[PDB]
């Protein structure tokens, strides 16, 4: 039998995330008669942000009230975005089902609390939580790539950012990946033994960060590169074994089912934080 089953559950990204990672647009929702694409991943995406080309405006800046505006909610009364963690807990202090949620889930629910159809609609905005200043940013624009030209990426500037869809589960800490696995190599459990991934796509990478960056670029995407049939439902090159000695990022698109002990390797995924190890 496979003793890795329970442990490896969080790396069945297709099952626990269930949507795009690089570009998450796994659901649709109607607003005033018109259908719109929507992020719907169940796991947070650590280190993911949006790079705005040509323009010098960062994407956490409020949307234009176009090149001078970002992706986030404009000022409101009362100010709902951006809102600190303590601000959110205070805002929902009378709601016992919400006030004690973890910062990422709370941020997801907070953004999902704002109904644009002012009838009930299913449209809930995605959100970014910035661990740096503990702020939740509600994203007014759900788009993630257009090549107003922009694209998603892991980046040093985005390492404390966390991209959150409306479906972020409240137990992501338990069932979703975050940290990279040090001295460990993803593998496939076969006949009572953990075997290597039989086929991988080798990309050179200077460090773990650059490997995680590459895995993200090649990961599940709900929108074809260079701009429903487009839904990945979590399928893609979501995993990577990084050999830190040979500086090889070994990227593959089948779920791992066990770990191999190897001090030359670090196990990463597209969802995982680009720095943190355990």
């Amino acid at each position: 039998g496979n003793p890795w089953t329970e442990y490896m559950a969080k790396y069945d990204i297709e099952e626990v995330h269930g949507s795009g990672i690089r570009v998450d647009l796994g659901e649709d929702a109607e607003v005033a008669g018109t259908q719109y694409r929507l992020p719907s991943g169940k796991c947070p995406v650590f280190g993911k942000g949006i790079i705005i080309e040509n323009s010098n405006t960062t994407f956490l800046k409020p949307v234009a009230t176009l090149k001078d505006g970002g992706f986030a909610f404009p000022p409101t009364n009362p100010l709902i975005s951006p809102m600190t963690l303590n601000g959110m807990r205070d805002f929902y202090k009378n709601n016992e089902y919400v006030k004690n949620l973890d910062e990422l889930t709370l941020c997801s629910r907070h953004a999902g609390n704002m109904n644009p159809d002012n009838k009930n609609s299913n449209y809930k905005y995605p959100a970014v939580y910035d661990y740096n200043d503990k702020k939740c940013h509600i994203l007014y624009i759900a788009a993630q790539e257009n090549n107003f030209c922009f694209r998603p990426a892991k980046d040093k500037l985005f390492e404390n950012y966390t991209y959150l869809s409306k479906n972020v589960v409240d137990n992501w800490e338990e069932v979703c990946p975050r940290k990279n696995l040090e001295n460990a190599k993803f593998g496939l459990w076969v006949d009572g033994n953990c075997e290597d991934i039989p086929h991988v796509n080798e990309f050179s990478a200077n460090d773990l960060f650059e490997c995680n960056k590459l895995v993200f670029e090649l990961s599940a995407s709900d929108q074809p590169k260079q701009y429903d049939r487009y839904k990945s439902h979590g399928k893609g090159y979501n995993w990577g074994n990084y050999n830190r000695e040979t500086q090889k990022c070994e990227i593959f698109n089948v779920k791992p089912t066990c770990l191999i002990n190897n001090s030359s390797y670090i196990a990463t995924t597209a969802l995982s934080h680009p720095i943190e190890v355990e």
Partner: peptide
Amino acid sequence: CWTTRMSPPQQIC
């Protein structure tokens, strides 16, 4: 303007 889904419902403009 938006309307909160969770009670108590309010409007945010």
